[PDB]
Amino acid sequence: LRARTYAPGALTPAPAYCGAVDSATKMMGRLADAEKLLVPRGWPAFAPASPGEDTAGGTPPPQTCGIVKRLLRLAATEQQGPTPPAIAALIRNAAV
């Protein structure tokens, strides 16, 4: 029950919002920055590919459906012990 549903305090009124709201492109920039921050401790890299690049490869789809998947996977990751979860590297707060 606890590991497969929203946290108890998420849907409770608060004076102000404490999340991350953005456009598409700046969201990509912030995601790249957070991934760079997290890489040095075990998190695997991304290695993407886009049309017009020097390597065609696969996954032609550009950053249109590739942001929601990453955001959802980041948001569904739980936390172990006193170490704050990974999402804190994007929201920039140690109380989420």
């Binding site: 997290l38 401790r41 075990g42």
Partner: peptide, 10 residues
């Protein structure tokens, strides 16, 4: 090969 603690996906 990594310093502790770790941060990994599921």
């Amino acid at each position: 090969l990594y310093p502790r603690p770790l941060v990994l996906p599921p």
